[PDB]
Every structure is written in structure tokens, then in C-alpha cells.
Design a protein around this ligand. Sequence first.
Ligand SMILES: O=C(O)c1ccc(C(=O)OCCCCO)cc1
Ligand SMILES: [Ca+2]
Length: 258
Amino acid sequence: SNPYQRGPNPTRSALTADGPFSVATYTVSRLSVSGFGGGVIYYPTGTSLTFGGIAMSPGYTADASSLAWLGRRLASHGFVVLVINTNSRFDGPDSRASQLSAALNYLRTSSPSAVRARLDANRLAVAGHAMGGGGTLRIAEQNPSLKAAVPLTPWHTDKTFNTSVPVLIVGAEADTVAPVSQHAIPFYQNLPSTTPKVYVELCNASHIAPNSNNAAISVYTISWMKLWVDNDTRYRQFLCNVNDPALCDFRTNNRHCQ
Ligand SMILES: O=C(O)c1ccc(C(=O)OCCCCO)cc1
Ligand SMILES: [Ca+2]
């Protein structure tokens, strides 16, 4: 009945590992594009289906490889994921927003045929690590068509974003680079009260927790993307009535659960 629904009924165990789909990659060379530094597209193969798309940005001084595990994890659960490299490794968060915007336009207008055949360009979301997550919040403000945004241990000097795009922010308790008291939590609190939003804080986690395989990040990022990109309400169970011992803070206005 939901034409965008993919994969068997989820289990928490299943969302901590690569999913039902084989994954291929397409390397986007830096010279092949303008507006961002190229990157890697992870996309499902062995299938004739189409899937929503996600543009993902790494953080300060980092490249696409720092989120390669997450790009492949999301792809394997049924998404087309472009993890970008930036024009300069020292680009700030608003620059990363512009480069996410170029990456989304590339997906919708300049995709390789192998990517486009697996892509429903009408259903796009964004995600990002650190300054990349700052850029995710800025692009959510500009582009109301986005289905979801997931900033991972985000960093931004701007603390105030206006968007109706549903936002789930992942904070890291022990983050000294983007302390949650100065970034993640102000971001959550200053988002509109009418916008479906969730803040989770991983116990004992560091700023680099998003840069390698992480069960909690996998569960919440897949579930948020499934819920909003696919309208797949089967993933409400992991985001609602939440009792998760991996988490040491949880905040929501609960607008995503019905
Ligand atoms: O995106 C990241 O992971 C990230 C974000 C911020 C810093 C940082 O040191 O902020 C202080 C200095 C600002 C520019 O020098 C480092 C890394
Ligand atoms: Ca602002």
C-alpha cells in the first residue's frame, strides 16, 4: 500500500548491520563536477527498484571516507547515498551547505544512468558529521522539499535554524570538539516547536563516534530516513516510546509518532 516501502519488517538487530540490499559504488571525480569536491555514491544493486536519495557531508579536515561505513550501511537498507568531498578540507558549515545543495542537484539532474535508474529524485534528505551537520541544518532552512535531516555531532556558529524538515540530531556525551551544550542541544532547542524533532545523546561517545561503525547511529539514522524518505511508519517503533540504554539524553516533541 506504501509504494516506497522497502525491506522486511525491521528489528533493532537488523538495523545494526548492513541491510537486505547489495551495494555498488560510483566514484564522482572532483573534476567531473562544480559546486562540490566529488565523492562516492553508494547505491543498491541486484534490484530493479528505486529508492530515496541522501546527500551526506563530512566535517572539518575530513573527507568522504570518514562516513564510508554509514554511506554503505544506509545504501544497504535501501537508499542512494552521495557522501561528498568538499572543495577545500577547511570549508566551514555554510560552505558545506552549498556543497550539499550542489550534490542534491547533481543527483536530480546529472546522475549517472546506473544511479538514476535506482533513484527516486522526488524523495531526498540530508545528513552530515560535525561542520557537515551544521551545513545540514542550513540546507534544511533553505530547501523545504527535503524529507529529513540528520546532523551527527553537529557544529555551527549559527545556533538558530527555521525549518519544517523533520530533524533528528545525534549528540555525543563526551564531545569536546562540538560540545553538546554549545551545539547539538541549542540546535534542537531553537528549532521550531511545530517541527518534528528528536535529540539523542550517546553515552560516553566522542566526537569521532560517527566516523566508524556505531550501533546507535545506525539505528536512529536508518529509522529517521526510513520514516520520512519512505513514509515507512514501521520504523516508528525505534523512535517512539524510546528506552535505549545507549542513550544518556533524549528529547522530543513527539510529532513523528502519529
Ligand atoms: O567538523 C569538525 O569535526 C570540527 C569542527 C570544529 C573544529 C574546531 O576546532 O573549532 C575550533 C576552530 C574553528 C576553525 O578552526 C574542529 C573540527
Ligand atoms: Ca540563524
